[PDB]
Design an enzyme around this catalytic site. Structure first.
Site, PDB file in Angstrom:
ATOM      1  N   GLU A 166       0.837  -1.189   0.000  1.00 46.52           N
ATOM      2  CA  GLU A 166       0.000   0.000   0.000  1.00 46.52           C
ATOM      3  C   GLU A 166       0.877   1.245   0.000  1.00 46.52           C
ATOM      4  OE1 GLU A 166      -0.533  -2.584   1.887  1.00 46.52           O
ATOM      5  OE2 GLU A 166      -2.644  -3.176   1.788  1.00 46.52           O
ATOM      6  N   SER A 177       5.622 -11.280   9.133  1.00 52.05           N
ATOM      7  CA  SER A 177       4.759 -11.927  10.107  1.00 52.05           C
ATOM      8  C   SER A 177       4.055 -13.087   9.424  1.00 52.05           C
ATOM      9  CB  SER A 177       3.730 -10.950  10.680  1.00 52.05           C
ATOM     10  OG  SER A 177       2.776 -10.593   9.693  1.00 52.05           O
ATOM     11  N   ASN A 192       9.232  -1.388  18.612  1.00 50.63           N
ATOM     12  CA  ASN A 192      10.230  -1.477  17.562  1.00 50.63           C
ATOM     13  C   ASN A 192      11.626  -1.280  18.124  1.00 50.63           C
ATOM     14  OD1 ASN A 192       7.934  -1.681  15.998  1.00 50.63           O
ATOM     15  ND2 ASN A 192       8.063   0.418  15.216  1.00 50.63           N
ATOM     16  N   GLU A 219      27.087 -21.212  12.924  1.00 51.13           N
ATOM     17  CA  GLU A 219      27.057 -21.872  14.224  1.00 51.13           C
ATOM     18  C   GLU A 219      25.663 -21.824  14.824  1.00 51.13           C
ATOM     19  OE1 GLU A 219      29.083 -19.888  12.963  1.00 51.13           O
ATOM     20  OE2 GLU A 219      30.973 -21.003  12.912  1.00 51.13           O
TER      21      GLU A 219
HETATM   22  N1  LIG Z   1       5.341  -6.787  12.330  1.00 48.24           N
HETATM   23  C1  LIG Z   1       4.514  -5.875  12.835  1.00 48.24           C
HETATM   24  N2  LIG Z   1       3.242  -6.225  13.198  1.00 48.24           N
HETATM   25  C2  LIG Z   1       2.379  -5.324  13.701  1.00 48.24           C
HETATM   26  C3  LIG Z   1       2.734  -4.008  13.874  1.00 48.24           C
HETATM   27  N3  LIG Z   1       1.647  -3.366  14.416  1.00 48.24           N
HETATM   28  C4  LIG Z   1       0.652  -4.285  14.547  1.00 48.24           C
HETATM   29  N4  LIG Z   1       1.101  -5.505  14.107  1.00 48.24           N
HETATM   30  C5  LIG Z   1       0.441  -6.826  14.036  1.00 48.24           C
HETATM   31  O1  LIG Z   1       0.814  -7.400  12.780  1.00 48.24           O
HETATM   32  C6  LIG Z   1      -0.292  -7.676  11.923  1.00 48.24           C
HETATM   33  C7  LIG Z   1      -0.129  -7.093  10.503  1.00 48.24           C
HETATM   34  O2  LIG Z   1      -0.712  -7.882   9.468  1.00 48.24           O
HETATM   35  P1  LIG Z   1      -1.411  -7.263   8.135  1.00 48.24           P
HETATM   36  O3  LIG Z   1      -2.445  -6.253   8.571  1.00 48.24           O
HETATM   37  O4  LIG Z   1      -2.038  -8.341   7.282  1.00 48.24           O
HETATM   38  O5  LIG Z   1      -0.275  -6.476   7.316  1.00 48.24           O
HETATM   39  P2  LIG Z   1       0.079  -6.640   5.749  1.00 48.24           P
HETATM   40  O6  LIG Z   1      -0.104  -8.020   5.183  1.00 48.24           O
HETATM   41  O7  LIG Z   1       1.507  -6.239   5.575  1.00 48.24           O
HETATM   42  O8  LIG Z   1      -0.912  -5.680   4.906  1.00 48.24           O
HETATM   43  P3  LIG Z   1      -2.152  -4.850   5.499  1.00 48.24           P
HETATM   44  O9  LIG Z   1      -3.338  -5.757   5.740  1.00 48.24           O
HETATM   45  O10 LIG Z   1      -2.576  -3.807   4.495  1.00 48.24           O
HETATM   46  O11 LIG Z   1      -1.675  -4.204   6.772  1.00 48.24           O
HETATM   47  C8  LIG Z   1      -1.498  -7.066  12.623  1.00 48.24           C
HETATM   48  O12 LIG Z   1      -2.567  -7.980  12.671  1.00 48.24           O
HETATM   49  C9  LIG Z   1      -1.069  -6.726  14.038  1.00 48.24           C
HETATM   50  O13 LIG Z   1      -1.600  -7.662  14.953  1.00 48.24           O
HETATM   51  C10 LIG Z   1       4.028  -3.633  13.491  1.00 48.24           C
HETATM   52  O14 LIG Z   1       4.487  -2.495  13.565  1.00 48.24           O
HETATM   53  N5  LIG Z   1       4.888  -4.563  12.982  1.00 48.24           N
END
Ligand SMILES: Nc1nc2c(ncn2[C@@H]2O[C@H](COP(=O)(O)OP(=O)(O)OP(=O)(O)O)[C@@H](O)[C@H]2O)c(=O)[nH]1
Ligand SMILES: Nc1nc2c(ncn2[C@@H]2O[C@H](COP(=O)(O)OP(=O)(O)OP(=O)(O)O)[C@@H](O)[C@H]2O)c(=O)[nH]1
Ligand SMILES: Nc1nc2c(ncn2[C@@H]2O[C@H](COP(=O)(O)OP(=O)(O)OP(=O)(O)O)[C@@H](O)[C@H]2O)c(=O)[nH]1
EC number: 3.6.5.-
Lengths: 168, 427, 438, 438, 168
Positions: C71, C140, C228, C254
């Site tokens: 996005e 994730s 973060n 290792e």
């Molecule tokens: N890794 C990470 N996870 C976050 C953060 N903030 C919230 N989250 C969690 O990580 C998940 C993000 O998944 P998605 O919403 O599918 O993100 P995406 O696939 O990259 O694309 P979008 O749906 O548009 O956001 C959320 O459900 C939150 O629970 C963050 O800053 N970093």
């Protein structure tokens, strides 16, 4: 006697509205530059801004967001006229006065006068246009601002000797 | 880029689109003349999802306004923001539907559909890529229902890859003014059920009761009630419009909402509703926010789901908030009434937060609910339809236009299908 | 030489990548312009940065990461950010549409036309790099858009280069909290697709992150800024051995070889002992015994699994700051005497230590403490199978009711993959239990 | 010595020649008057210009190029421009009638009364010329008036002078964009009439030029200004070997001898690697490995032919700037090790290398980069056959229905020409596949 | 103060028109030259052009293009008396005062005053008629123009000291 900073706080709040309006300012500026055709220059003179604004300004913002820039550079001259007379001044206040007098100018050397932390303007700035051009143009306002707040910063420490220098 | 173009139809749409668009314009700080006043970089950047730009800083709305009687559009043009709307988007017929569903579905539509399609495809070519269209109408509208069914039928194949968001106000269960509104609405929903994806259900008794509840100011305008509902729908729109880590897209929301296709009818929810002295008599904190938002009376769409249970809930939060408060609020509501949820899925809770405050108020929110309360509603409609179809009241107009009872037979068969559908799922 | 390349997929991963690279430039003293002061550090890109940044004769560092996002929103935010002049313009890969949290939508519909250019970025980094020890990826399982794209990209890079290291890092699906319910689907899909090509997967959870934040940092209203920052100090700890040397150096090689007894299972958990508030560490003291007690404390974990129910296989302790072998080996000897910890009888040795003399660094405007002695405890145990137990207990009912599946089948998938995902999971538990069986 | 005569035919080519010599005056500092400043250059007339410009004791440089156009419009506007004082008066051949895109009109009706004049021009150039190695022809395949006149004049220069070289350069028909459908007809006529006489043919296509412009030059509103800027930079680079020196100098004659394996097919393809915007130039680094990977990136080349569909036969890299053969040969060794790039078995090697130390030059009012190392890529590969395949399946059904025929048959031609040309291109394609098969 | 620059702006828009009709003026000047027979001379004195006007001018354009050049010459002539008074001026301003006062001369030497970039007039000048004649006669207007403009450039630089030098 303190009202200079009363005005200055509104001026800097305008500067923060410009902080919101900075990528927009250059966004319009670059369309203006394309139409004015002088891309080979570091932008220091506001004459480029006038050449930008007199024409091809058919969209609302095109006039206002340029004209308030001249408005604020006129307002700073209005403030500096107050500093010009007041008292004669201790040497440091004098030096601030004369350097600001010089730096208040139409086509001056305020081209690549980049500053120190935080001065986020160039930090937020994008790319080569901002690193070869876009120098003093974005930072000259806060430069004058801080170097004029040091002018009042010695005013409270101006003794009885300096309370009457050019007022009498 | 990716934008949204809107369909305004029906004599409710007449006022509703006006109020909604002017709310947006004020929210973005543009003068009534149309020249934006530079205050918000984010909105200036992101305007391209709703408004195209015209010479003069004129962010022209991409809304297509349709009706039949010229007086309503004359009044709208004389309104404070008729100028924002273009002669291009002023398309209309030169007659009256009588608010007859059959007439507005076959007779005058047969002559207006070409031009309305022309306008919408004009805008479509003008722009690059849509999320889709959202519609403002009512199933309680004799002309809105018919013409909207016509246009959705025209477009759901024409752009089979977009969002068919709809906004419709159900007629008051205690009074529907016209007596044939049940027939009109039944046919309209018969066409809507297989076509649409999203439908926001609205009712006006709830608006009046909210006025008596917290507005308490005796005599507002229907326009002010439109102000409130427009604030709600604007809040649901702003997700795409503004930054802050929340997944905004209406498809993001819908795919997270609808367990099975036949779920197209939805219950919104809103955040601080404040009275004359409660501005200084309110402690603006996230927990009491949550309490108010999930109050027994803060609902505004159909009726108390207290009879039934909860299917899905989504909460969006506009302002300077943090993650932990909404997380713990979710935990607390889950623990408060785990029973009132449905066992087939836990965690019906969906969360989204935008970090941009509204103008006037700092931190607020919106809510959308899919619950088991529309059942009693369409059970009402089923009962009135059975009654009026028992003696075949008011049918000679429909016959003269050229319809038949067979249509109603299969349409109400479908309605009973949805009846048994909901009863099976949540029972 | 000593360099690894980072991928960051998902707008959930973009802010964490931004924060960690910010931290890096801070301790490196990278001016936000991209250029150093009068002191000379630049050259053919060979100094403390040549592992992470790349500062050729132009004098501007090139971070060795690429941020891919579906996005425009946050990617353009950072495209307007402060260190954007440092950031490569089109290393911030951006798309126009969403995966809508839909695994297949994000893996098939639009991936095909972005993967090619991102591979071009990868190879145009590969040509310049030499050592290329591996990759570091911020993602994730529950990628609302990142997950499916990540799965396809991981498959593609696994098949194109199968000699380096793949380092996956994810949030775990919160055990009893869910902001969305497409996540139970997409998580198992990513898992069963990645198990056979992924190399080393590490995991975190925000609930226990916050729990720490108000346990010892005592912050009643922390934020993603702190989230973060802490994951950033975790990765900085794991990359310190590359940043500098210590008494003895170790490497990802290792890390795998020791950390993996047997294949498939490559899902350990990191922990950071000296997590404490500034005032607390100001008026307390730190040393080996207490930091070891902390890293073995059963609640400082950020995964909702209990060691007292699980059974340990691996522990790697990475010390950064000032220590001596004597007291640290005394502490670890006391540990291996201690009877509460129940490793397998299988491993006589289950400990691996890595030393750096350089103390951890802080951030101006931070909220952490003055750590002169830190340690990262990367441990793997049988306690983890409960998470997959809970997730399958969640998923079986969703699958039987086949809710939400209309969208997936409409975009064009089927049911056999959703089946084989659960038999892969059942395989995962049947491999978790018999190994814990001694 | 070293010098050549340039031909510029077609209102398509007039402005491009104008721009080319506009560039040319820069590097020599030729003032728009015709005289260099007070530094001693005027005299016998022997310096860097003596190959292209002619500055006698009269002190005015005189280009050895011919501008021919059949319409007064653009030639009069340039005859009202700024360098017309430089321009010799009647080497700007102005025409009073047009060829109507009709090859036979511009080859029969109008050429005869002007071929004599152009012959007189070229002979009163050849007398003063001594080395006069060849001719650099800038034209267009779909020549609206550059087709037939060019064909006739190339025939005449071939018959009168078959001892020296001929350098043909023209815009290839846009593969999927059609400004005219008489264009394929006149193009095939020109091709089959040229195959037996054209010495060194090279083609250009604007679509991928535009694609490059918004890819890496990063312009959403470029123009011919930029187009001709790119092509003029290309031809300046190729003339650099004559202009200045380096490690080695190689001439068009060797370009021919090596670059052509076998006769007829003399249709290679040029490319420039460091095409990039000045911003990326400033905040990136340039060197042999990355520029070579770019030059072998399949989409950096203006022609819509897929090399991974084809197989390479010839490549020639020209290095403008300061480099070392050390890394040069290292990069080419990596190339030979590479398995994706598939040269034919017949050629063991495939490179011709050229070096000149002088870095390229930017232009005032220029959109290009501050490039230090540059490479020109002259390559020939089998896949190009696809272009004539596409043209012929365009041709066949047109030919079946015999459209527009009344025009040509009335102006005085018949079918036998186009009949011949079809099996001519058939022979072209069949030898293409014959050499493709080993 | 800036009223004279306001008038210039129109003057140089008419100069932009001069760009459009400059060669036609040259051709009409030829039509004058053949019947004038002062052909061995680079044109520098406008007395030659007055000797041009009175005869062989029975076709509208002949007078229409020709006359207005002297109209603008008299325009700048009027402009110079206002400059004559103001204040004594900063040294550079005074030097420009002498320059502008000196150049106004009807029978002057302005025949071969070639100028630098861009000054496209000689660029458009065709052949040796302009390489032995037609020099400063075609751009003496920019010569006064640019230097009087950089005169008023120091007006924004003028201090309080230079505000009152000759005005009283
Ligand atoms: N890794 C990470 N996870 C976050 C953060 N903030 C919230 N989250 C969690 O990580 C998940 C993000 O998944 P998605 O919403 O599918 O993100 P995406 O696939 O990259 O694309 P979008 O749906 O548009 O956001 C959320 O459900 C939150 O629970 C963050 O800053 N970093
Ligand atoms: N604009 C507007 N609509 C109202 C108002 N009050 C109730 N409505 C309802 O909004 C409904 C939808 O309007 P339309 O879709 O335009 O209705 P229609 O097809 O023209 O049929 P009618 O019911 O006869 O108006 C109407 O049927 C009304 O019942 C009001 O004050 N203003
Ligand atoms: N080489 C070149 N080609 C151009 C240029 N601009 C456009 N073109 C393409 O080149 C073609 C011009 O060929 P022609 O139309 O036959 O020109 P011509 O043969 O000299 O005679 P005309 O019919 O009068 O134009 C057009 O179809 C364009 O697609 C340019 O500046 N240079």
């Amino acid at each position: 006697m303190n009202e200079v900073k009363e005005s200055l706080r509104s001026i800097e709040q305008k500067y923060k509205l410009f902080q919101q309006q900075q990528f927009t300012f250059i966004a319009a500026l670059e369309h203006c530059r394309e139409n004015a055709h002088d891309k080979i220059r570091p932008i220091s003179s506001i004459e480029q801004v006038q050449s930008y604004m007199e024409h091809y300004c058919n969209n609302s913002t095109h006039r206002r967001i340029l004209i308030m820039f001249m408005d604020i550079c006129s307002e700073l001259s209005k403030l500096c006229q107050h500093f010009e007379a007041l008292h004669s001044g201790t040497p440091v206040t004098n030096s601030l006065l004369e350097k600001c007098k010089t730096l208040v100018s139409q086509s001056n050397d305020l081209s690549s006068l980049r500053a120190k932390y935080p001065h986020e303007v160039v930090n937020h700035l994008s790319c080569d246009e901002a690193r070869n051009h876009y120098g003093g143009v974005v930072s000259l306002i806060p430069i004058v601002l801080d170097f004029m707040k040091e002018w009042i910063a010695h005013s409270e420490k101006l003794p009885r000797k300096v309370l009457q220098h050019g007022t009498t | 880029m990716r934008e949204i173009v809107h369909l305004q139809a029906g004599q409710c749409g007449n006022q509703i689109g006006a109020k909604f668009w002017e709310v947006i314009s004020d929210e973005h700080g543009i003068d009534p003349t149309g020249t934006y006043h530079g205050d918000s970089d984010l909105q200036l950047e992101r305007i391209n999802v709703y408004y195209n730009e015209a010479t003069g800083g004129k962010y022209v709305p991409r809304a297509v306004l349709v009706d039949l009687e010229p007086g309503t559009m004359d009044s709208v043009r004389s309104g404070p923001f008729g100028q924002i709307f273009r002669p291009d988007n002023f398309v209309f017929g030169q007659s009256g539907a009588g608010n007859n569903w059959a007439k507005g579905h076959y007779t005058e539509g047969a002559e207006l559909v070409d031009s309305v399609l022309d306008v919408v495809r004009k805008e479509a070519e003008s722009c690059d890529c849509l999320q889709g269209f959202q519609l403002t109408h009512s199933l309680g509208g004799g002309t809105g229902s018919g013409m909207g069914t016509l246009l959705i039928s025209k477009i759901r194949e024409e752009y089979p890859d977009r969002i068919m968001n709809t906004f419709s106000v159900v007629p008051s269960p205690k009074v529907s003014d016209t007596v044939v509104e049940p027939y009109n609405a039944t046919l309209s929903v018969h066409q809507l059920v297989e076509n649409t994806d999203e439908t926001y259900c609205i009712d006006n008794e709830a608006l009046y009761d909210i006025c008596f509840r917290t507005l308490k100011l005796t005599t507002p305008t229907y326009g002010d009630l439109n102000h409130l509902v427009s604030a709600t729908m604007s809040g649901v729109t702003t997700c795409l419009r503004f930054p802050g880590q929340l997944n905004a897209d209406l498809r993001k929301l819908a795919v997270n909402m609808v367990p099975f296709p036949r779920l197209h009818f939805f219950m919104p929810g809103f955040a601080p509703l404040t009275s004359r002295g409660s501005q200084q008599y309110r402690a603006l904190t996230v927990p009491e926010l949550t309490q108010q938002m999930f109050d027994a009376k803060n609902m505004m769409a159909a009726c108390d789901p207290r009879h039934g249970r909860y299917l899905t809930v989504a909460a969006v939060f506009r302002g300077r908030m943090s993650m932990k408060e909404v997380d713990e609020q979710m935990l607390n509501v889950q623990n408060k009434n785990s029973s009132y949820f449905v066992e087939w899925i836990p965690n019906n809770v969906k969360t989204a937060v935008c970090d941009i405050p509204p103008r006037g108020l700092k931190m607020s929110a919106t809510f959308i609910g899919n619950s088991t309360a529309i059942q009693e509603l369409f059970k009402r409609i089923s009962e009135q339809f059975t009654a009026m179809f028992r003696r075949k009241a008011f049918l000679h107009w429909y016959t003269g236009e050229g319809m038949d009872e067979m249509e109603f037979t299969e349409a109400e068969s479908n309605m009973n299908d949805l009846v048994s559908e909901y009863q099976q799922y949540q029972d | 030489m000593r360099e690894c390349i980072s991928i960051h997929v998902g707008q959930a991963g973009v802010q964490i990548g931004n924060a960690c690279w910010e931290l890096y430039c801070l301790e490196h003293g990278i001016q936000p312009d991209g250029q150093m002061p009068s002191d000379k550090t630049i050259g053919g890109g060979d100094d403390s940065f040549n592992t992470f940044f790349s500062e050729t004769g132009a004098g501007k560092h090139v971070p060795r990461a690429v941020f891919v996002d579906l996005e425009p929103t946050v990617v353009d935010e950072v495209r307007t950010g402060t260190y954007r002049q440092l950031f490569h313009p089109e290393q911030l890969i951006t798309g126009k549409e969403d995966a809508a949290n839909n695994y297949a939508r994000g893996h098939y519909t639009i991936g095909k036309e972005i993967v090619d250019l991102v591979l071009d970025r990868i190879r145009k980094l590969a040509d310049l790099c030499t050592g290329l020890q591996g990759f570091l990826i911020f993602h994730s399982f529950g990628g609302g858009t990142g997950s499916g794209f990540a799965s396809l990209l991981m498959e593609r890079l696994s098949v194109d280069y199968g000699k380096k290291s793949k380092l996956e890092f994810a949030i775990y699906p919160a055990p009893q909290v869910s902001t969305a319910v497409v996540e139970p689907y997409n998580s198992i899909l990513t898992t069963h697709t990645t198990l056979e090509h992924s190399d080393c997967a590490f995991m975190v959870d925000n609930e226990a992150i916050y729990d720490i934040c108000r346990r010892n940092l005592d912050i009643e209203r922390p934020t993603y800024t702190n989230l973060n920052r802490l994951i950033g100090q975790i990765v900085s700890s794991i990359t310190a051995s590359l940043r500098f040397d210590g008494a003895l150096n170790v490497d990802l090689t290792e890390f795998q070889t020791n950390l993996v007894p047997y294949p498939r299972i490559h899902f350990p958990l990191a922990t950071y002992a000296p997590v404490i508030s500034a005032e607390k560490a100001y008026h307390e003291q730190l040393s080996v015994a207490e930091i070891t007690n902390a890293c073995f404390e059963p609640a400082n974990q950020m995964v909702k699994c209990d060691p007292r129910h699980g059974k340990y296989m691996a522990c790697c302790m990475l010390y950064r700051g000032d220590v001596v072998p004597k007291d640290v080996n005394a502490a670890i000897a006391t540990i291996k005497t201690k009877r509460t910890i129940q490793f397998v009888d299988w491993c006589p040795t289950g400990f691996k230590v890595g030393i750096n003399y350089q103390p951890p660094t802080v951030v101006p405007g931070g909220d952490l403490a003055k750590v002169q002695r830190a340690v990262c405890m990367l441990s793997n145990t049988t306690a983890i199978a409960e998470a997959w137990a809970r997730l399958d207990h969640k998923f079986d009912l969703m699958y039987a009711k086949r809710a939400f599946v209309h969208w997936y089948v409409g975009e064009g998938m089927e049911e056999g993959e959703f089946s084989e995902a659960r038999e892969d999971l059942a395989a995962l538990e049947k491999d978790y239990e018999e190994v814990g069986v001694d």
